[PDB]
Structures are given as C-alpha cells and as structure tokens.
Amino acid sequence: KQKIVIKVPMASDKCRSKAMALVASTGGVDSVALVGDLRDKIEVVGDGIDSIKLVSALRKKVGHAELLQVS
Amino acid sequence: GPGMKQKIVIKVPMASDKCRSKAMALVASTGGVDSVALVGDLRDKIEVVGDGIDSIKLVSALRKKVGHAELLQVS
Amino acid sequence: KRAIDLSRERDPNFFDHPGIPVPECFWFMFKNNVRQDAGTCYSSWKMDMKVGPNWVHIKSDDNCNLSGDFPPGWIVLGKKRPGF
C-alpha cells in the first residue's frame, strides 16, 4: 500500500474531471483526493499502483503530470 | 459535515473490480467532488466529499452507466 | 459473533478525506447483534443513514454515543477513535 501524489496542470474543470476519472479507474485504488488551491494535485492511496505508468497515462490524457511523492 | 462540504455514501455494484472502478471513475469525474474512497466492511460503498453534489442525480447516473446504486448516508 | 463488544471489534475501513475535519468516532451497525457495516462519524453531530429498511436520523454526543429510532433488530453504536 502506497500514497502517490501527482501534480496535473489543469486548463479547466474538464481536465480535472478527466484526471480524477483516470486515477480513480486505476486497479488497486482505495482513495483519490484532489487538493491544492487550483485543485491540481491528486493524492491516490492503494495497492500495486505503478506510479510511473499512472504519470504516463495522465501525460497522454490530460497534461504534463509531475510525480511529487511515492511513500 | 461540519463546514461547507457534503459527505455521502453510495453502495455500488460489485459485478467485478472493473465495475467498481467504473463507479469510482464516474463519481470522481463529477463536478464539485473533492475526494472519493471505497468504504464499508466489504469495500462495496463509495464515500464522496465535496460541495454542490446532487446525491440523487449521482445515484441515477451510476444506475445508468455502471449498475445498481443505493444512497446509504448523508452527513 | 452475536454479543456486541465494541472493545473487540476490528476498526472500520475509513479514509480521512483531506478537505474536511477528521471525524472523532467509529460507528458499527448490527442486525440481531451481528455486525453488518461500520465507518467513521463526527462527534456532536448528526447524519442520516440507511439502517435495514429505514432511513434513520442519528445524533452523536460529545462522547460518540449515538441515538436514533432504529428498526426492530438493528442498532448503530459509537465509540471514540484512537487519539480522540
């Protein structure tokens, strides 16, 4: 079980919706929280999540996702 | 809950892990949602926190897109 | 089990959502003294919860004691979380 935090630059609430849907759809997810003043940091907790693959998926779907924390 | 955020709990279909993940994705995608978590003794419920969430509209959307859904808590 | 003992109940599944205060209580729902579900809730607060066939308004006091008009065979009980 890990806590992963990813910054996803958001152009709009459509970006936030897409990013949250993608993360929450991921196998092994327990929880997802959208945090930050601009609601552009995603905290995801769960088991067997590949943080690099999740960042790559967000880069493809949304925007230049940046990995902040894996713990 | 105390303050300006709503917390609700919706029981979601457990047809498969993928079905439960589709339900998670739909709720997480909803306007005004801050956070979602799998809760319940059987991890068959989604707890969602945010503001301006229409719990009844969300139940209807889950039933349309995913499978049967049931509101179980508002706080 | 079939005798309620909150001192021996496993902690519920929970997530302390970051956008809201951390709830102080655990609740446990029983039918015929058999655990059906559990979660977190605020002390000194109120919630509406589906308890068997009925929607029930549940109040909590400052010590996580819960009150509500539960349908026959059902009860929801509270206790303080660790550190509260």
Author numbering:
A (entry chain A): 188 to 258
B (entry chain B): 184 to 258
C (entry chain C): 30 to 113
Direct quotes from the study:
One example is rice Pik-1 that comprises an integrated heavy metal-associated (HMA) domain. In the K-type pair, Pik-1 acts as a sensor that binds the AVR-Pik effector via the Pik-1-integrated HMA domain, whereas Pik-2 is required for activation of immune response upon effector recognition. RGA5 and Pik-1 detect three unrelated effectors from the rice blast fungus, Magnaporthe oryzae, AVR-Pia/AVR1-CO39 and AVR-Pik, respectively, via their integrated heavy metal-associated (HMA) domains. Functional characterisation of a resurrected ancestral HMA (ancHMA), dating back to early Oryza evolution, revealed that different allelic variants of Pik-1, Pikp-1 and Pikm-1, convergently evolved from the weakly binding ancestral state towards high-affinity binding and recognition of the AVR-PikD effector through different biochemical paths.
To interpret this model from a structural perspective, we attempted to determine crystal structures of the ancHMA domains in complexes with AVR-PikD. Crystallisation screens of the heterologously expressed proteins resulted in crystals of the ancHMALVKIE–AVR-PikD complex, which diffracted to 1.32 Å resolution. The structure revealed an overall architecture of the complex similar to that of previously published co-structures of Pik-HMAs and AVR-PikD. We note that the MKANK/EMVKE and IAQVV/LVKIE regions map to two of the three interaction interfaces previously described to underpin binding of AVR-PikD, and other AVR-Pik variants, to Pik-HMAs. Among tested constructs, only the Pikp-1:ancHMALVKIE chimera associated with the effector at levels similar to Pikp-1. This indicates that the polymorphic residues in the IAQVV/LVKIE region are critical for the evolution of enhanced AVR-PikD binding in Pikp-1. AncHMALVKIE formed the strongest interaction with AVR-PikD at levels similar to Pikp-HMA, followed by ancHMALAKIE, then ancHMALAQVV, ancHMALAKIV, and ancHMA, which showed weaker interactions; we did not record any significant binding for ancHMALAKVV. These results indicate that the two most recent mutations, Ala-222-Val and Val-230-Glu, collectively referred to as AV-VE, determined HMA transition towards high-affinity AVR-PikD binding. Close inspection of these structures revealed that the Val-230-Glu (V230E) substitution enhances the interaction with AVR-PikD through hydrogen bond formation with His-46. This bond is formed by Glu-230 (E-230) of ancHMALVKIE but absent in Pikm-HMA and ancHMA, which carry Val-230 (V-230) at the structurally equivalent position. We concluded that this shift is consistent with different stoichiometries of the ancHMA–AVR-PikD complexes; while ancHMALVKIE–AVR-PikD formed a two-to-one complex, the constructs with the extension interacted with the effector at a one-to-one ratio.
